[PDB]
Structure formats: C-alpha cells, structure tokens
DNA sequence: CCTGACTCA
DNA sequence: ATTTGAGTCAGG
C-alpha cells in the first residue's frame with residue numbers, strides 16, 4: 001500500500017533539502033544505544049536505510065550535519081543524542097512532532113508517533129509497542145516489518161507537520177515551539193551527552209561508612225522495639241508501632257496504618273523509636289538510591305552519569321530528569337547533602353558553578369496577579385520566606401535558620417496554591433484555628449493575590465484551560481465537575497499551573513540566551529544541569545569571574561517583569577562546595 | 580506489577 | 589476534603 005524503497009546505498013534524491021527523518025532507537029534510554037534503522041521521506045519518495053550503511057556514508061553524514069538541509073522528526077533530542085554517541089552531528093531539525101503534540105495538549109501523554117497521529121485522526125501508522133513488544137518480549141522485527149514501520153512514521157511526520165503547525169498558530173503557540181522548545185531541545189541534548197563526572201572513590205567510601213551507620217541505627221531500633229523486623233516495610237512497621245507498642249493511630253490508607261514521615265513526627269511524644277525509624281529510612285534511601293543506584297549508572301571508563309531530561313512530560317511545562325534523576329540530589333540535611341561532594345568537574349582545574357532564582361514563583365505571581373504589596377515587597381528587596389518564618393516561629397530576622405526558612409517557603413507556596421486550615425495545621429503541627437489565622441493575615445497582606453486566585457479559577461471554568469506567559473496551555477476538563485473532590489483538584493491546578501508553568505517558561509528562555517552568550521564570548525563553560533529554577537555549569541577556573549557576571553545577568557534579563565528577578569550564585573571544587 | 584516510603588523543585 | 593509539580597526504591 002505505502003510504496004517505499006529499501007535502499008542498499010544512499011542516493012542523491014534521499015538528500016533533498018527538506019525531509020521527514022526517522023533515526024530509530026528502540027531502547028528507552030538512548031545513551032550509547034543502537035540505531036536500528038533510518039527512514040527518509042521527501043518530495044522524491046520514501047526510503048529505508050540500514051544504519052551500518054548510511055552512518056558510514058560520507059554524503060549521508062554530511063547531510064545530517066548540514067543546517068540548511070531541514071529535517072522534520074519526532075523526538076529529535078533522542079536522535080541527536082544517539083547520533084552523538086555514534087560520533088555524528090545532527091543539524092537543521094526544523095520541526096519536532098513530539099514537542100508540537102506536547103504543547104497542543106500535555107495531558108494526552110503523547111510518546112510515540114501513532115499517539116500524535118491520533119490527534120488528527122491519522123491512522124496509517126502503528127504504535128511502537130505493538131511493533132516491538134514489551135518487557136522481555138521486546139525485539140526488533142524482521143527487516144521488511146521494521147522498514148515499513150519506520151517509513152510509516154516518517155510519512156506520518158511528513159503529512160502531519162502542516163496540520164500541527166496550523167493548530168499551534170491558531171493557539172498562538174507557534175513561536176513557543178519554534179523559538180523556545182525546539183532550540184532548548186538541542187541544548188538539552190548537549191547537556192545529556194556531556195554528562196556529569198562522579199568521584200566514585202569518594203562515593204564508594206561514603207557507601208561503606210553509611211552501611212556501618214545503618215547497622216548501628218538498625219540495631220538500636222530493634223532494641224527499642226523489643227524485636228527484629230523489617231523497618232523498610234510499612235506493613236511490618238505498622239504492626240510494631242500500632243499493635244505491639246500501642247501507639248495512637250493518626251491516619252490510615254487503603255492498605256492499613258499510615259507510617260508516613262508526617263505521622264511518625266507527631267508520634268514523637270509517645271515513643272523515641274519513631275525518630276530513630278525516620279533516621280533509618282532517610283539513611284536507607286541515601287544508600288539505595290544516591291550511592292548504589294548512582295554507581296550502577298556511572299559509565300566506568302569516563303566515570304560520567306548521563307541523565308535524560310524529559311521535555312514532553314510534565315503538565316506545567318517543567319522538565320523532568322530520569323535514569324538517574326539529577327534534579328533530586330539531597331541538599332536539605334547535611335547527612336545527605338554530602339552526596340554532592342561526589343559530583344565533580346570533568347577536567348582538572350575546572351569548577352562547578354551553580355545559580356538559583358530567588359523566590360522565583362512568588363515574583364512571577366506578583367507580576368501576573370499584579371498584587372500591590374507583593375510587587376512592592378520585591379522592589380524593596382524583601383525576603384518573604386524569612387519574613388514569614390519570623391512570623392510563624394515568633395523569632396527575629398536573626399533567629400531564622402535555613403531549615404526554618406525552608407519551612408516558611410512551603411507555607412508561602414502552600415497558601416497561594418490553595419492549602420486549607422487543616423493542611424496548614426498538620427504541616428506546622430499547630431491548631432487549625434491558628435492555621436486559619438495565618439491564612440487570613442496572609443491574604444490581607446497580599447489582597448491582589450487572593451483576587452487573582454478567585455479570578456483564574458472562574459476563567460478556567462469558562463474556557464476549560466489556563467495559560468502561561470509564553471502561551472503554554474493546560475486543559476482542565478474536570479473543573480466544572482459536580483464532584484467536589486474532582487472539581488477542587490482542578491481548581492488548585494488552575495491556581496498553580498499558570499505560575500509554576502510561567503516560571504518554567506522563564507528558565508527555559510534563560511538557558512537559550514545563556515548559551516548564545518557563552519558562544520559569542522567563546523567561553524569553554526557549559527551547562528551541565530537544570531533543576532527547575534537552577535542552572536548548574538562547569539568551567540575552567542579562569543572563567544569564574546566572568547561567569548559571576550554573565551550567568552546571573554542573563555538569567556535575570558531572560559524576561560522583563562513588573563518586579564525584579566534576582567539570582568543567587570556560587571562555585572567550588574564540587575557541587576557540594578558550590579554554596 | 581503497585582504502594583508507600585524517601586528525595587528534589 | 590483539605591498546596592503544586594516531579595523519580596526511584598524495597599517490599600510485597
């Protein structure tokens with residue numbers, strides 16, 4: 001039905017200056033993964049190429065790397081990174097169907113061509129899973145079966161480009177795709193392929209010392225409990241706490257007694273064992289995830305870890321980070337924070353540079369809600385987190401520890417994002433009456449915020465979606481539900497999504513501008529990680545003074561708001577020391 | 580395989 | 589009924 005040529009060799013007509021291109025990587029993690037087949041669809045026809053052939057052809061390599069030869073693809077970052085592991089540079093990607101689908105509706109969770117094709121009732125293509133199988137059954141099919149699939153995906157991208165571009169424009173999301181998400185994709189590809197170097201000697205030594213400590217904590221817990229049990233089993237732990245030790249049951253879930261951190265902290269006046277158990281579970285996560293888990297994914301020859309930043313997953317426009325996640329490395333307790341000493345520069349005499357947006361979503365909220373007191377508070381360069389802390393704990397602006405400031409931060413965001421008196425009371429372990437009062441005195445300080453939250457909920461109910469500064473959209477079909485719980489969740493997404501998502505837009509624009517600046521000044525410095533409202537770089541030590549100016553400036557100037565943007569920054573010999 | 584732990588923004 | 593957005597892990 002769909003004619004295509006199974007080429008034995010690359011020909012001139014395959015190298016047209018506009019094409020839909022498929023460079024197939026079947027493994028979920030595409031770092032150093034096999035390329036199993038290539039497809040090209042253009043004005044001249046439809047082609048399948050064997051990668052052994054095509055990727056060793058100097059004209060095909062040349063075409064891939066030619067910025068003036070425009071390619072339409074699906075998940076171009078996957079291809080770009082797979083090709084870098086093959087030592088080949090991919091340039092000129094002009095359209096990405098994955099990112100196009102993501103912006104049109106992130107709720108669809110589009111993650112193959114067939115799923116994007118369905119958005120426009122295009123059915124002449126199969127889902128990837130149906131072709132390759134799942135779990136232990138996964139496999140590349142016989143060549144003719146593989147070739148047809150790849151070509152059908154290329155044909156889909158080719159015929160779907162205009163319809164998707166048309167709808168993006170209708171939505172005012174065309175520049176968001178072309179000028180923000182697509183250029184970011186290339187930047188993320190660079191970051192992933194660069195990787196972050198790990199000090200495995202230090203990490204392994206930390207692991208040995210941690211094992212000993214876990215043993216000591218473990219034995220003490222058994223002593224306190226009067227028996228041995230699996231502390232890492234919430235079920236067994238529940239029996240010990242609420243049956244053997246007869247402690248009060250504060251919460252249940254569908255599976256049985258809750259042993260959450262929040263519940264165990266509240267049980268501290270009844271038995272010292274709950275504090276030990278909380279310590280044990282913290283240490284155990286360090287070991288399983290940040291020592292053992294991390295060392296499993298280090299590439300042994302280079303000692304580097306290579307994350308994958310998922311650009312088309314979160315419902316608000318944030319990135320996520322997987323295998324390993326490098327956006328949740330410990331920082332909040334000194335015990336876990338020391339993990340960051342194992343993340344080091346990739347060359348000697350280089351350093352790690354880290355920058356963080358100050359009170360980021362509160363600034364954005366001030367701008368969007370146009371609240372008087374809040375907009376003013378940032379012109380006066382106030383720290384609303386610390387002020388809130390002084391108030392909540394009844395202390396002076398010098399008795400506020402970092403932990404206290406962090407706890408205030410969750411209260412400040414909690415409130416603007418819809419926390420109830422019950423939630424706030426449980427969060428700070430205070431009376432609900434007292435909690436209700438903090439909330440009241442909060443919306444009195446910032447009345448425009450309150451209006452904005454009422455107003456954005458009403459709007460969402462009328463339009464059925466909310467939007468960000470750069471025209472990112474989230475649909476919220478549940479917001480007019482007759483069901484209280486379902487409706488309430490959707491209403492809180494309407495409160496949060498425009499703010500978190502606008503803040504995502506900003507740091508994304510900051511990454512693009514920053515790279516442009518790094519290139520024009522021909523610095524060796526380069527981005528390693530993004531952590532939502534943080535950018536981590538490494539660079540020669542001689543570039544630290546110039547970065548101290550360049551990085552914060554670019555980040556602060558990324559957009560222009562009604563309030564200042566403020567960036568904190570540091571550097572040092574390890575990620576830990578960049579504080 | 581899911582749930583409830585821990586980790587971050 | 590009860591802040592938002594994420595990922596990985598051991599246990600079961």
Ligand SMILES: Nc1ncnc2c1ncn2[C@H]1CC[C@@H](COP(=O)(O)OP(=O)(O)OP(=O)(O)O)O1
Pocket residue numbers: 356357358359360361362385409410413414417532533588592
């Ligand atoms: N508990 C929470 N609830 C909702 N959103 C939160 C959150 N914690 C963080 N976020 C969201 C909202 C904030 C944003 C960034 O996290 P930062 O810790 O960096 O908060 P920032 O306000 O920038 O504080 P600063 O840098 O001055 O210490 O992510």
Ligand SMILES: [Mg+2]
Pocket residue numbers: 356357358359360533
């Ligand atoms: Mg911040």
